[PDB]
Amino acid sequence: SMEQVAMELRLTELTRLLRSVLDQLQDKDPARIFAQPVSLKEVPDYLDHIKHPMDFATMRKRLEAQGYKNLHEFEEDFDLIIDNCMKYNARDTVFYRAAVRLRDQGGVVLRQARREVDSIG
Ligand code: NA
Numbered sequence: 646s647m648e649q650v651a652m653e654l655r656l657t658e659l660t661r662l663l664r665s666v667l668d669q670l671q672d673k674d675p676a677r678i679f680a681q682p683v684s685l686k687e688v689p690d691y692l693d694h695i696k697h698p699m700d701f702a703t704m705r706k707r708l709e710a711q712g713y714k715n716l717h718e719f720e721e722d723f724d725l726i727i728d729n730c731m732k733y734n735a736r737d738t739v740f741y742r743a744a745v746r747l748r749d750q751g752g753v754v755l756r757q758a759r760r761e762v763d764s765i766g
Contacts, residue, residue, distance in 0.1 A: 656711050657711065662761060662765070663716070663719055666754060666755070673747050676739075679730070679743075699722050716758065716762045727751075730743075
């Protein structure tokens, strides 16, 4: 149907907007602390601590399969990156501190992307 094609164009356009959001968020992580999944070789107990791991590569895979239906879903995954790190790592670590910074600096990027998704429908 033509209705299905239009829904598809909307998903594609959301995907394009989210790809740019994701590059912008990831520049707020120059150290590449959240670039890839936590290694289970190197942190074998990780899953006893954190039930839903997230990272930017896993988000990028989901994105390119147009697996985000809206901004809220995308925000949930971003927030898992931060919230996971702040539980697993203590306050006085480079890892926790990099989450706080990614959070604060990501907040601005997301505040405008919410306006762009409402605005552009
Ligand atoms: Na903790």
